[PDB]
Point group: C2
Chain length 159, copies 2
């Protein structure tokens, strides 16, 4: 406390095409246990700002050049010991230049949000959507891969 | 990378009284070099979610009981080595119960936002306001106490 603690910083971005209102999602082939739509995102480097990391990830993975990003909210995951956490910063953006990398034809797809379901998407994508669309802004999971619920101040404050 | 890094997590909350539209600020006496309006906030404990920490801080310092908080954005500060960072999560809230602690009469004040100036407030408060009011959502400073500027992806990515 009152200085640093271990945090795994990750970003996630929902890019919207202002001309069609569709959003950009990773739509790649994979083994049955990993297949599913997912939003671009990755790890924030040490020394690297979070929003900068988000813009870089989108560029490196999709080729799109975001002029900036707008913050939507956070998702937090804790292990059993809770000595560390994964902090995901979710951003949205609709202002960009460039086009999808030819290197990712059948790897990236523009889809209406309504096309995304819990069944055809990566774990917790519906929850991420709640954050991206603005219905929620602070979700937390008590397991590194558990269910994300709204954070409203409930905790073992007396410990 | 690709797991944890040292991050000093801090929260800051702008509470608005829906009946007057005024915001709650710390308005305490202090030496000349520390005096100035400031928004409540503090350090996030290990194991403790960020939004939960924000709600706790407001309760412990003001007595107000927030039913929840809405994310506004982030402020990041880096030292010269950039090996660590201070990540500030800014929230806003207008739904609460309780009243100001008698323990903080001339310590807390409800003031219209227009009453806050760079001259009568703590360092970077104008920038925090930009985030709280929604004009910006991702600010970064290249010094532990420097000027907060909008994060739009500029960095030494080639290093």
């Amino acid at each position: 406390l009152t200085r640093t603690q271990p945090v795994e910083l990750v970003t996630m971005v929902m890019v919207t095409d202002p001309e069609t209102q569709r959003v950009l999602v990773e739509d790649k082939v994979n083994v049955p246990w990993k297949a599913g739509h997912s939003f671009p995102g990755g790890h924030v480097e040490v020394g690297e700002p979070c929003a900068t990391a988000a813009i870089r990830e989108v560029f490196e993975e999709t080729g799109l050049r975001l002029s900036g990003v707008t913050f939507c909210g956070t998702c937090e995951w804790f292990d059993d010991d809770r000595q560390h956490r994964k902090l995901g910063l979710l951003y949205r953006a609709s202002n960009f230049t460039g086009t999808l990398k030819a290197s990712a034809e059948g790897q990236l797809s523009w889809l209406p949000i309504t096309a995304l379901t819990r069944e055809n998407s990566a774990a917790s994508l519906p929850e991420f959507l709640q954050v991206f669309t603005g219905t929620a802004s602070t979700l937390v999971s008590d397991s590194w891969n558990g269910n994300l619920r709204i954070d409203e101040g409930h905790h073992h404050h007396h410990h």
